[PDB]
Write a protein that binds this ligand. Sequence first.
Ligand SMILES: *[C@@H]1O[C@H](CO)[C@@H](O[C@@H]2O[C@H](CO)[C@@H](O[C@@H]3O[C@H](CO[C@H]4O[C@H](CO)[C@@H](O)[C@H](O[C@H]5O[C@H](CO)[C@@H](O)[C@H](O)[C@@H]5O[C@H]5O[C@H](CO)[C@@H](O)[C@H](O)[C@@H]5O)[C@@H]4O)[C@@H](O)[C@H](O[C@H]4O[C@H](CO)[C@@H](O)[C@H](O)[C@@H]4O[C@H]4O[C@H](CO)[C@@H](O)[C@H](O)[C@@H]4O)[C@@H]3O)[C@H](O)[C@H]2NC(C)=O)[C@H](O)[C@H]1NC(C)=O
Ligand SMILES: CC(C)(C)c1cc(Cl)c(C#N)cc1OCc1n[nH]c2ncccc12
Ligand SMILES: [Ca+2]
Ligand SMILES: [Ca+2]
Ligand SMILES: [Cl-]
Ligand code: NA
Ligand code: NA
Ligand SMILES: [Zn+2]
Length: 807
Amino acid sequence: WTATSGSCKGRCFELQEVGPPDCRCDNLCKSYSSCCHDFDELCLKTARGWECTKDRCGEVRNEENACHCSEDCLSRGDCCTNYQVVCKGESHWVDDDCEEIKVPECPAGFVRPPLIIFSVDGFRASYMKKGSKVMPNIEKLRSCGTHAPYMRPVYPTKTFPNLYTLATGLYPESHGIVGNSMYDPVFDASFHLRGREKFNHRWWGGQPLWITATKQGVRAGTFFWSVSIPHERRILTILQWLSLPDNERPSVYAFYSEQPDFSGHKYGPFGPEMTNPLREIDKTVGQLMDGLKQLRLHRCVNVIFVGDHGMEDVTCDRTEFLSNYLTNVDDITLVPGTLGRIRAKSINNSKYDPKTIIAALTCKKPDQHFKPYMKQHLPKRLHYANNRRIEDIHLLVDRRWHVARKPLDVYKKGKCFFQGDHGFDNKVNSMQTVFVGYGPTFKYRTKVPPFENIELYNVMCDLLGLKPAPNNGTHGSLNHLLRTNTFRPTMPDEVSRPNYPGIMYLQSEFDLGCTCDDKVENKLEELNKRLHTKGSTKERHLLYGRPAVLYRTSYDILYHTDFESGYSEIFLMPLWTSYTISKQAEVSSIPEHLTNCVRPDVRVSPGFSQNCLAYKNDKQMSYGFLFPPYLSSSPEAKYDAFLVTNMVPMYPAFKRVWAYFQRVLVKKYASERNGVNVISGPIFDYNYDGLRDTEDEIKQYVEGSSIPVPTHYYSIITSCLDFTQPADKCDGPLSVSSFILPHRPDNDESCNSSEDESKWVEELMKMHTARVRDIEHLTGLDFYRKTSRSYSEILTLKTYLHTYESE
Ligand SMILES: *[C@@H]1O[C@H](CO)[C@@H](O[C@@H]2O[C@H](CO)[C@@H](O[C@@H]3O[C@H](CO[C@H]4O[C@H](CO)[C@@H](O)[C@H](O[C@H]5O[C@H](CO)[C@@H](O)[C@H](O)[C@@H]5O[C@H]5O[C@H](CO)[C@@H](O)[C@H](O)[C@@H]5O)[C@@H]4O)[C@@H](O)[C@H](O[C@H]4O[C@H](CO)[C@@H](O)[C@H](O)[C@@H]4O[C@H]4O[C@H](CO)[C@@H](O)[C@H](O)[C@@H]4O)[C@@H]3O)[C@H](O)[C@H]2NC(C)=O)[C@H](O)[C@H]1NC(C)=O
Ligand SMILES: CC(C)(C)c1cc(Cl)c(C#N)cc1OCc1n[nH]c2ncccc12
Ligand SMILES: [Ca+2]
Ligand SMILES: [Ca+2]
Ligand SMILES: [Cl-]
Ligand code: NA
Ligand code: NA
Ligand SMILES: [Zn+2]
């Protein structure tokens, strides 16, 4: 209940929320059906429109007008935004030449440059270029300020997940807004676009920027605007708040436009009808900047122009129906569209089986436009699993397509309405969105590389002098956007120092069940192999320092001619293995006599070694090697590759992937990149939280042993960004690509896996591309500790994702 017979007189767009049943005069009142009776009359005035004209100049103040052209309007803070242009001979902001803002130029009583976030729904990255002729205000922001060619959204590429990521720095799995629609089984409650449950605070995890600000003494404007408040009134309200007294005035503000998303759904991303919404958004930007200029704030305020996601061409005819695959289609609930989420219609049905649903949806039609996954098997770059609101079964839908339960869902919701949609995999080009920063704290005329929207919360906090709440950004990775206010991070401290074992065991102390045909015998070459086991080639194979171990554990550094490793006594395998392959390196085969060779490592105790008998007796599990025997520098060096300390457990199906990567792709990348340094290793993430498992979280071991089975294998492949220099003699910036491959007992994910590895393996590896940072979270390791580069630059490198999309 609301007692709507109080009044909004002098309270219009009040910042503090008053509690029921007292009637409200803030934005949200409309969305809650709780505004006072006179809210429209007093707070939503429209009389005479939004622009001054010559005949209104110097008018007598009429309080009914939407905005004012009277002499007193500047001091009242309520002129139409074009007032000084029409009445005082001033230029529009867009007509002024760009001049570098070297320092904030703020009115007295301004303690810090304010931040205004201008968010645009569905603003696809390529609009900046393709629409530039109709968006002069936006183009001036972009060209004069700091811009990226695009910004990567989070998955799913929907509105609420991305806007709340912008506000928190968190992945959807952590903040809780995992889609525009959700069921929470602990609450037994549903979240929808329509209606009232979406306002309950239990949906919204983390700490959004407005709360971070408020807790630290910085006042915030509203972030959520009711759909019926027109854009001109949103801008006027921001400008009015900016004229408040110092003690009352917010420092952070947000504007939101429902466009161009609204029209893009109807007409497609480049429909001819899209030109007008882009014109209109630009006009609104022009109003803001003109308004700021009137207040003498245009060289004081930092402005962020940012989108939530892009838009793709999607029509009703490109719909896959689960009714064409499953017999049991009425025993499931599907969350449909540009992603699929499946759960049981009834939790009383004990004949519901996820395995049989997945199998009925796997590779059933030759041009099938979706792929089913258990959520823990989704590419780790998506970070889309660790939330009870994300259903166990997930469908990744091909760009340009939808998935639905039955045809009737599409025509009874029989002809097609829509031509655009979004929600797809966040690496897809059409889903990419925009970032522009303009103001005293941003750089002048500066282009920066594409980056992820999870990074922006930290920067917004830096722009406002706030300490960010714990989040998924990597604070410092965006310092290159900023003139000043940089955050100066330090490297994390190493927690565990390594042991450096020498030769401590005789061959006969081992009873591992391993064989090797290696009884094959010189003081020239005897001292030389000794130097290699003490680390004489380490400078070649460990280019960026050894990774630091950031948790408590017991591990050994092991040196060899061709590779170096950090060997875990707890997990009985390397945490990491590092090696460099020059452009000139040669690929050889595993000699016939060494096919089943595994050799005891006399530096490492039997008790902390793997054994071959375990693999013999585990009928499902085989083994691979981290440093590949195929890339040995010489016949004699190859024996090192067969050490028991270089062995890792591998399903035969996965060994097909791994063998092709090692035998073919590494050498290909070395030829293309002019050498590469490779770091490879295992990952254990049995609870799919994106974070390194402790020993007691491991769910699977090689049968009859304490050898833990990795969930994933990673590689980090580094070279010189200037590819005219070899990877091992690089003077400047680095270039990286990485992956986190799921360690699966089948290749069901790859529908073409019966074919030669040259037709499917690289495609798999591209799907599972990763950031170095993702591998850091999953391993508790810290890479690139010893380079010549600035730490901020290295942080940027660690956040890079190699996407494999063209332009
Ligand atoms: C991305 O960045 C984020 C933020 O940095 C990272 O998330 C953090 O990860 C930490 C480790 O997983 C985690 O720390 C835990 O916090 C517990 C207290 O949690 C509450 O308080 C915080 C602080 O205000 C709050 O933010 C939390 O909010 C979550 O939950 C509510 C709903 O309940 C949601 O509104 C919200 O969206 C959020 O949900 C997300 O996180 C939770 C986990 O907290 C997930 O379950 C959800 O699916 C969702 O992803 C909480 O309200 C604390 O109690 C934990 O302590 C246990 O573990 C320690 C280890 O040191 C152990 O010593 C203790 O014994 C203790 O164990 C006891 O509980 C166990 C489980 O009940 C039990 O088995 C034991 O036997 C013990 O009884 C733990 O420290 C931190 O909360 C989150 N923060 C957020 C915001 O998500 C994320 O990791 C980053 N991602 C990547 C990939 O890097
Ligand atoms: C989390 C939240 C959605 C409040 C949000 C976050 C940020 Cl960071 C911004 C910014 N800039 C805007 C935000 O909301 C804008 C908004 N208003 N009205 C809407 N209606 C439908 C959909 C979105 C909106
Ligand atoms: Ca949106
Ligand atoms: Ca884990
Ligand atoms: Cl109302
Ligand atoms: Na086996
Ligand atoms: Na297959
Ligand atoms: Zn949309």
